[PDB]
Amino acid sequence: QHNKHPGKTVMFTRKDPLKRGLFSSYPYIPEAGPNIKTGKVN
Amino acid sequence: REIVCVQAGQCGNQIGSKFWEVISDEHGVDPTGTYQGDSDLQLERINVYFDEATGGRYVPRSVLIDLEPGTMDSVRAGPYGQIFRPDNFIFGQSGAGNNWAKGHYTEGAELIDSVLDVCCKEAESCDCLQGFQICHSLGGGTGSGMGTLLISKLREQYPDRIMMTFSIIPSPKVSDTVVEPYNTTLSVHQLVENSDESMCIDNEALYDICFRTLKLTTPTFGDLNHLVSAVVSGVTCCLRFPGQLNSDLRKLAVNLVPFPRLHFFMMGFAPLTSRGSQQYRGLSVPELTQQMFDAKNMMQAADPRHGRYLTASALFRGRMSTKEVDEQMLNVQNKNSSYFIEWIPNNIKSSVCDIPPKGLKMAVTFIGNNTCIQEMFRRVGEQFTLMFRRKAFLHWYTGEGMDEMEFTEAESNMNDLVSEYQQYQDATIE
Ligand SMILES: Nc1nc2c(ncn2[C@@H]2O[C@H](COP(=O)(O)OP(=O)(O)O)[C@@H](O)[C@H]2O)c(=O)[nH]1
C-alpha cells in the first residue's frame, strides 16, 4: 500500500467570484400686480 | 541585495547542486560560466547570485561543507560541477556518524574556523548584503550539528541581516535514522533562538506529490530536489526581476511572523500538472489558487483542517491583472472564514512579478504560517520522552561530553512552543 498525505481538500474557489464584477453596490434611494400704464392722449 | 548560500551535509550538497543547475538555466549561464543568454533582463541582476570573474565568467556565492568529501566528489563530477570555486569546498577526514554531539563538538570545532573565514570573505564581497540561505537536514549529523553551529556564529557576526533555512524533517511513518528524535529536538531548540524564518519539508509529502499529482513511473531524488529547487528559486524571484508589486525577504518576514517564536512555515508550489492531463485544464489565476490551497500540494504532513491560518503569502510570476489576484484572495478569505484567525483582518499578502520561469506561462509559490505545525513537535517530543526515560542510546551523546541538562532544556523549550501555538489557536476577542 502506498502512503498518503493526511490532509483532505476543504478550500474551494471559482472563476469570476464577484457579483456582476463589482466589489460593492450602493442601494437605490428615491427622490404680481398691475404695471405702469400709459399711452397716447390729448 | 545579495544572497549567500550554505550547503551542509549530503542532503544539502545535493539540493544545492540542483538549485544551482536551475538558477544557471534561468539566467542562461553555460556550465563553463559564460553568459549565453538572450535578454538584458537576465544580465541586470546576475550579481544577486553570481560574482563576476575575469573575461566573462560567473561564480556562484556558495559554501560547501561536509565531514567526508564523497558527496562533494559526486557534485564536482556532475555536469555543472566545474562552476564551483575550488577554495569553497571545506572538508574533514572522518564522518559525523549521524551523531549530533560529534558533529557539533568534535569535528565542528576543528573545521568551523575555515568555514567562518570562507563565509566572511563571501559576505564582505557583496556591495549590500541581504540575508543568508542555508540548506540542511535536521535528522542527520553534520547537517544538524554544523548547520546550527554555523548559524550561531553568523548570528553573532551579522545580527542585523536575515537568517533563512530550508530543512528536512523526519517523516511520521518510516524513519531514515534510528536516533532522529534527539537530533531533531536539539536542532529545533537551536533554531527557535537563532533563526528568523524556517521552512520544513517531509520526504513522504514529496513522494505522494510525485506519485499522485505527477504520476511519475520511476521518480528519483533528482525530481524531489528539482521541486525543492523550484520553490527555493521562486521565493527570491521578486528580488531579481521587475514587477507591478515588488517584494523582499524582509517584507515576507514582517508580514508572516506575528510573534518572534512563531516563525515556522509551510511551503508549496502550484503549477504541477499531471504527465497526461494538460489538455484538460487551462492556465488561469483561479486554477493556480485552487492548486495553491490544496493540501495535496503542501510539502509537510500536517493538515490545515486541524488548525487555523495566522498569515499566508503568495508570490505570482507572469503577466496578469491585479484585480484577479485581489478578488481571488478576498473570495478565499470570505468563503472559508472559519480557518482564518479572526483578530487579524487580512491574513494573505500578494505580490506580482512580470517574468515567469522558462516554459511556464505563470507560476506562484505559497508560504503558510499555520498552527497545525504544533502536531509535528508534539509527536517528536513524545518519541524523545520515550527514548530518554530509558537512556535508549544516550551513552553516545554523554560519552562525547554532553550534559543531560541540555536535553531537558530542549524538551522544555519545545513543549512551551507547542503550548504557545495551542494558546494562540484558542484565543478569543471577548
Ligand atoms: N530530499 C532529499 N532528502 C535527502 C537527500 N539525501 C538524504 N536525504 C534525507 O536526509 C536524511 C539523512 O540525512 P543526511 O543528509 O544523511 O545527514 P548527514 O549524514 O549529516 O549528511 C534522511 O531523511 C534522508 O532521507 C536528498 O538528496 N534529497
Q: In sequence order, what DSSP letters do the residues of B256-291 get, joined into one string?
A: H-SSTT--EEEEEE-----TT-GGG----HHHHHHH
Ligand 1 centre and the CA of A13: distance in Å?
A: 37
Residues of A in contact with B207 (CB under 8 A): 3
Q: Does ligand 1 have an atom closer than 6 angstroms to the CB of B145?
A: no
Is residue A17 less than 8 Å (CB to CB) from chain B? yes
Helix (H) or strand (E) holding B165: strand B163-169
Is residue B311 within 8 Å of residue B344, measured between CB atoms?
yes
* Residue (of B289, B350, B284) closest to B315 by Cα position: B350
Q: How far apart are CA B128 and CA B126, in angstroms?
A: 5
Q: How far apart are CA B14 and CA B140, in angstroms?
A: 14
* Residue (of B26, B69, B67, B65) closest to B48 by Cα position: B26
Cβ pair A12:B298 closer than 8 A: no
Q: How far apart are the first and last CA of chain A?
A: 130
Q: Does ligand 1 have an atom closer than 6 angstroms to the CB of B221?
A: yes
Interface of B with A (CB under 8 A): 173, 204-205, 207-208, 211-212, 284, 286, 289-290, 293-296, 298, 301-305, 327-328, 331-332, 335-336, 339
State the amino acid at position B363 in one-letter form. Answer: A
Is residue B269 within 8 Å of residue B227, measured between CB atoms?
yes
Q: Which segments of B340-381 are extended strands (E)?
A: 348-353, 363-370
Question: For residue B123, how many C-alpha atoms fall within 13 Å in the half-sphere facing its CB?
Answer: 18
State the amino acid at position B287 in one-letter form. Answer: E
B186's CB contacts (< 8 A; 6+ apart) are B100, B144, B148, B406, B407, B410
List the helix and strand counts (H, then E) for chain B: 16, 12
Q: How far apart are CA B420 and CA B430, in angstroms?
A: 19
Three-class secondary structure of residue B356 per DSSP: coil
Q: Does ligand 1 have an atom closer than 6 angstroms to the CB of B108?
A: no
**Residues present in chain A in total:** 42
3-state helix, strand, coil split of chain B in percent (to 5) is 50, 20, 30
Ligand 1 centre and the CA of B11: distance in Å?
A: 4
Residues forming beta bridges with residue B64, ordered by sequence position: B7, B89
For residue B336, give how far its alpha carbon lies from the nearest alpha carbon of chain A (Å): 7
Cell of B186: 536539539
Largest CA distance in chain A: 130
A3 closest CB neighbour out of B208, B284, B289: B208
Cβ pair B331:A14 closer than 8 A: yes
> What is the structure's resolution, reported in angstroms to one decimal?
3.2
Distances (CA, A) of B308 to A27, B35, B297, B374, B412: 35, 46, 18, 11, 24
Distances (CA, A) of B14 to B104, B152, B184: 21, 23, 21
Give the DSSP letter of residue B68.
S
Is residue B46 within 8 Å of residue B40, measured between CB atoms?
no
For residue A25, give how far its alpha carbon lies from the nearest alpha carbon of chain B (Å): 15
Q: How far apart are CA B247 and CA B264, in angstroms?
A: 20
Helix (H) or strand (E) holding B143: helix B142-157
Largest CA distance in chain B: 67
Three-class secondary structure of residue B419 per DSSP: helix
Neighbours of B72 (CB within 10 A): 21
State the amino acid at position B101 in one-letter form. Answer: A
Atom of ligand 1 minimally distant from the CA of B12 = 15
* Residue (of B269, B292, B298, B281) closest to B356 by Cα position: B269
A15 closest CB neighbour out of B205, B207, B284: B284
Q: Which segments of B10-102 are extended strands (E)?
A: 50-52, 58-60, 62-66, 89-91
Sign of the dihedral through C-alpha B329, B322, B235, B209: positive
Q: Does ligand 1 have an atom closer than 6 angstroms to the CB of B229?
A: no
Q: How far apart are CA B322 and CA B119, in angstroms?
A: 40
A9's CB contacts (< 8 A; 6+ apart) are B294, B295, B296
Q: How far apart are CA A30 and CA A9, in angstroms?
A: 47
* Dihedral, CA of residue B277, residue B280, residue B286 and residue B290, to nearest 10: -40
Question: For residue B143, how many C-alpha atoms fall within 13 Å in the half-sphere facing its CB?
Answer: 26
